[PDB]
Design a protein. Sequence first.
Length: 259
Amino acid sequence: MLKIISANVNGIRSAYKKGFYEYIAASGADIVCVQELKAQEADLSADMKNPHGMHGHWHCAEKRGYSGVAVYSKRKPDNVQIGMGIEEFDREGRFVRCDFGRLSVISLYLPSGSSAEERQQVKYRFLDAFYPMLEAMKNEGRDIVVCGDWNIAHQNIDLKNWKGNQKNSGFLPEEREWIGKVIHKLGWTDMWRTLYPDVPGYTWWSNRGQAYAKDVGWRIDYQMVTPELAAKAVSAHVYKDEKFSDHAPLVVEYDYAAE
Ligand SMILES: [Mg+2]
């Protein structure tokens, strides 16, 4: 099967100290989309550019130690898009797209809003700029997986403390509505929720201490998929046998090849 892994690595240099490099190979992944490199190109070792000889494409931020995304693939993409073409967001290294024939896979790091109202506003402006891109992408008629950290939990099932987080970034009414539109208006499939309707599937906890031990989790990482490819998804899991990051890798297996 085609195995695609989405992982917010909370700093690729940190994740590599915790075994993430070995996992890229051991996992059997064909494509690994990572978010939050916290590294510029000058900081990336050869094994962070082309892990295990994979092809790698990345978009780093202008600020040091910040953001950045990458897509690693066993096969060579025939086309690569670095950034969205919106300067404000592209300066932060948040979007890479790799094409393999009629398959496209994206690594997306959606802005977080919990730090300050200014950043919640950036987050909302990102949502408004990205929605028409999602619409256009859906209308391409190609097979597309948008992997990444969307920084929004959709429904009560998607986080442990839904009662106490309705005024906090990640579970605001406007944010949840926006994800709902991406699914129900645009017709993207939330692959995890479609595969396993009743299984929470948290992918983030604020630390590896109490927050993790007590499973105070949120499902904020997704694979959003086009219709025909969604029908080819056979299984998924949140990988928790090792801990590389404050997020867990989201792994989906598709009965699909680009040739
Ligand atoms: Mg982080």
